Protein backbone atom coordinates (compact mmCIF):
# COMPACT_ATOMS: atom_id res chain seq x y z
CA UNK A 1 0.00 0.00 0.00
CA UNK A 2 1.24 3.51 -0.86
CA UNK A 3 -0.55 6.88 -0.50
CA UNK A 4 -0.92 6.98 -4.28
CA UNK A 5 -2.69 3.61 -4.27
CA UNK A 6 -5.09 4.79 -1.53
CA UNK A 7 -5.75 7.93 -3.54
CA UNK A 8 -6.27 6.14 -6.87
CA UNK A 9 -8.58 3.39 -5.55
CA UNK A 10 -10.78 5.96 -3.83
CA UNK A 11 -10.71 8.21 -6.91
CA UNK A 12 -11.75 5.60 -9.50
CA UNK A 13 -14.66 4.52 -7.30
CA UNK A 14 -16.00 7.55 -5.46
CA UNK A 15 -15.37 10.18 -8.17
CA UNK A 16 -14.41 12.72 -5.51
CA UNK A 17 -14.67 16.48 -5.96
CA UNK A 18 -12.10 16.69 -3.18
CA UNK A 19 -10.10 13.87 -1.65
CA UNK A 20 -7.45 14.14 1.05
CA UNK A 21 -5.34 11.15 2.08
CA UNK A 22 -2.77 11.64 4.86
CA UNK A 23 -0.23 8.92 5.65
CA UNK A 24 -0.03 9.08 9.46
CA UNK A 25 2.31 6.10 9.76
CA UNK A 26 5.45 8.12 9.07
CA UNK A 27 5.39 7.30 5.37
CA UNK A 28 5.26 3.58 6.09
CA UNK A 29 2.10 3.29 3.96
CA UNK A 30 0.40 1.43 6.82
CA UNK A 31 -2.02 3.93 8.42
CA UNK A 32 -4.12 6.71 6.91
CA UNK A 33 -6.61 9.51 7.56
CA UNK A 34 -9.03 10.19 4.68
CA UNK A 35 -11.47 13.00 3.81
CA UNK A 36 -13.77 12.58 0.79
CA UNK A 37 -16.28 14.93 -0.86
CA UNK A 38 -18.51 13.51 -3.63
CA UNK A 39 -22.02 13.91 -5.04
CA UNK A 40 -22.25 10.12 -4.76
CA UNK A 41 -22.78 10.68 -1.02
CA UNK A 42 -26.01 12.61 -1.61
CA UNK A 43 -29.13 10.63 -0.68
CA UNK A 44 -27.17 8.34 1.64
CA UNK A 45 -27.00 8.30 5.43
CA UNK A 46 -23.47 8.17 6.84
CA UNK A 47 -23.39 4.40 7.47
CA UNK A 48 -24.13 3.79 3.77
CA UNK A 49 -21.48 6.38 2.86
CA UNK A 50 -18.91 4.67 5.07
CA UNK A 51 -19.71 1.39 3.29
CA UNK A 52 -18.99 3.05 -0.07
CA UNK A 53 -15.56 4.23 1.08
CA UNK A 54 -14.76 0.81 2.58
CA UNK A 55 -15.83 -0.96 -0.62
CA UNK A 56 -13.63 1.43 -2.60
CA UNK A 57 -10.44 0.65 -0.64
CA UNK A 58 -11.28 -3.04 -0.16
CA UNK A 59 -7.82 -4.31 -1.17
CA UNK A 60 -5.96 -1.83 1.05
CA UNK A 61 -8.05 -2.74 4.06
CA UNK A 62 -6.57 -6.25 4.01
CA UNK A 63 -3.13 -4.82 4.80
CA UNK A 64 -3.36 -1.49 6.69
CA UNK A 65 -3.05 -1.02 10.45
CA UNK A 66 -5.35 2.01 10.77
CA UNK A 67 -7.89 4.02 8.78
CA UNK A 68 -9.67 7.18 9.90
CA UNK A 69 -12.36 8.28 7.48
CA UNK A 70 -13.00 11.82 8.73
CA UNK A 71 -15.37 13.26 6.12
CA UNK A 72 -17.63 11.64 3.50
CA UNK A 73 -19.34 14.87 2.53
CA UNK A 74 -21.76 16.16 -0.05
CA UNK A 75 -20.37 19.32 -1.68
CA UNK A 76 -23.01 21.24 0.28
CA UNK A 77 -21.62 19.95 3.59
CA UNK A 78 -18.06 20.63 2.45
CA UNK A 79 -19.01 24.22 1.58
CA UNK A 80 -22.11 25.27 3.54
Amino acid sequence: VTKEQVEASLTSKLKPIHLEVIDISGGCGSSFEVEVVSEQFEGKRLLERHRMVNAALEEEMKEIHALSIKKAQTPQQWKP
Binding site: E33, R45, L46, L47, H50, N54, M61, I64, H65, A66, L67, S68, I69, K70, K71, A72, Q77
Partner: protein
Protein backbone atom coordinates in the same frame (compact mmCIF):
# COMPACT_ATOMS: atom_id res chain seq x y z
CA UNK B 1 -11.55 -14.03 13.62
CA UNK B 2 -12.75 -17.63 13.32
CA UNK B 3 -16.34 -18.47 12.31
CA UNK B 4 -17.28 -18.96 16.00
CA UNK B 5 -15.83 -15.57 16.88
CA UNK B 6 -17.70 -14.07 13.91
CA UNK B 7 -20.97 -15.63 15.10
CA UNK B 8 -20.37 -14.28 18.61
CA UNK B 9 -19.50 -10.81 17.23
CA UNK B 10 -22.69 -10.79 15.16
CA UNK B 11 -24.76 -11.55 18.26
CA UNK B 12 -22.76 -9.11 20.38
CA UNK B 13 -23.22 -6.08 18.10
CA UNK B 14 -26.96 -6.81 17.84
CA UNK B 15 -27.43 -7.30 21.59
CA UNK B 16 -28.20 -3.61 22.26
CA UNK B 17 -29.38 -0.95 19.77
CA UNK B 18 -26.12 0.95 20.31
CA UNK B 19 -22.86 -0.82 21.26
CA UNK B 20 -19.58 1.02 21.91
CA UNK B 21 -16.39 -1.02 21.93
CA UNK B 22 -13.88 1.29 23.57
CA UNK B 23 -10.71 1.75 25.59
CA UNK B 24 -12.05 1.60 29.15
CA UNK B 25 -15.58 1.79 30.53
CA UNK B 26 -18.26 4.48 30.13
CA UNK B 27 -17.50 5.87 33.62
CA UNK B 28 -13.74 5.50 33.10
CA UNK B 29 -12.60 5.91 29.51
CA UNK B 30 -8.85 5.31 29.22
CA UNK B 31 -8.23 7.37 26.07
CA UNK B 32 -9.49 10.74 24.84
CA UNK B 33 -10.95 9.41 21.57
CA UNK B 34 -12.98 6.91 23.62
CA UNK B 35 -14.11 9.69 25.99
CA UNK B 36 -15.24 11.88 23.08
CA UNK B 37 -17.69 9.19 21.90
CA UNK B 38 -18.99 8.46 25.42
CA UNK B 39 -19.66 12.18 25.93
CA UNK B 40 -21.48 12.35 22.56
CA UNK B 41 -23.73 9.44 23.57
CA UNK B 42 -24.44 11.25 26.87
CA UNK B 43 -25.14 14.55 25.06
CA UNK B 44 -27.73 12.74 22.95
CA UNK B 45 -28.90 10.72 26.02
CA UNK B 46 -28.50 7.40 24.19
CA UNK B 47 -28.70 4.21 26.21
CA UNK B 48 -25.81 1.95 25.09
CA UNK B 49 -23.60 -1.02 25.98
CA UNK B 50 -19.94 -0.14 26.57
CA UNK B 51 -17.37 -2.93 26.07
CA UNK B 52 -13.73 -2.69 27.22
CA UNK B 53 -11.39 -4.02 24.52
CA UNK B 54 -8.22 -3.23 26.51
CA UNK B 55 -8.83 -6.38 28.54
CA UNK B 56 -9.70 -8.65 25.61
CA UNK B 57 -7.11 -8.93 22.82
CA UNK B 58 -9.04 -11.52 20.79
CA UNK B 59 -12.17 -9.36 20.88
CA UNK B 60 -10.10 -6.32 19.90
CA UNK B 61 -8.53 -8.08 16.92
CA UNK B 62 -11.76 -9.74 15.80
CA UNK B 63 -13.65 -6.43 15.93
CA UNK B 64 -10.88 -4.71 13.94
CA UNK B 65 -11.58 -7.14 11.09
CA UNK B 66 -15.36 -7.33 11.59
CA UNK B 67 -15.81 -3.54 11.37
CA UNK B 68 -12.80 -3.25 9.06
CA UNK B 69 -11.77 -0.40 11.39
CA UNK B 70 -8.46 -1.12 13.12
CA UNK B 71 -8.60 1.51 15.91
CA UNK B 72 -10.88 2.04 18.91
CA UNK B 73 -13.50 3.26 19.80
CA UNK B 74 -15.80 1.46 17.37
CA UNK B 75 -19.49 2.40 17.51
CA UNK B 76 -22.15 0.02 16.21
CA UNK B 77 -25.79 1.08 15.85
CA UNK B 78 -28.66 -1.18 14.79
CA UNK B 79 -26.36 -4.18 14.67
CA UNK B 80 -24.17 -2.54 12.02
CA UNK B 81 -20.83 -0.77 12.36
CA UNK B 82 -21.58 2.94 12.19
CA UNK B 83 -18.07 4.27 12.60
CA UNK B 84 -14.99 5.14 14.60
CA UNK B 85 -14.34 8.29 16.63
CA UNK B 86 -13.91 10.63 13.63
CA UNK B 87 -17.02 9.32 11.86
CA UNK B 88 -18.96 9.65 15.13
CA UNK B 89 -17.80 13.23 15.78
CA UNK B 90 -18.74 14.40 12.29
CA UNK B 91 -22.08 12.59 12.66
CA UNK B 92 -22.70 14.43 15.95
CA UNK B 93 -21.91 17.74 14.23
CA UNK B 94 -24.38 17.00 11.40
CA UNK B 95 -27.22 15.33 13.33
CA UNK B 96 -26.66 12.08 11.41
CA UNK B 97 -25.70 10.16 14.56
CA UNK B 98 -28.98 11.10 16.19
CA UNK B 99 -30.76 10.04 12.98
CA UNK B 100 -29.14 6.59 13.14
CA UNK B 101 -29.80 6.13 16.88
CA UNK B 102 -33.41 7.18 16.26
CA UNK B 103 -33.63 4.67 13.40
CA UNK B 104 -32.33 1.89 15.64
CA UNK B 105 -34.49 2.73 18.68
CA UNK B 106 -37.62 3.00 16.53
CA UNK B 107 -36.91 -0.23 14.62
Amino acid sequence: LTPQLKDTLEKLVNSEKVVLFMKGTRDFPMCGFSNTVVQILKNLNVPFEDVNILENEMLRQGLKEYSNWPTFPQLYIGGEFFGGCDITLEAFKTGELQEEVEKAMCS
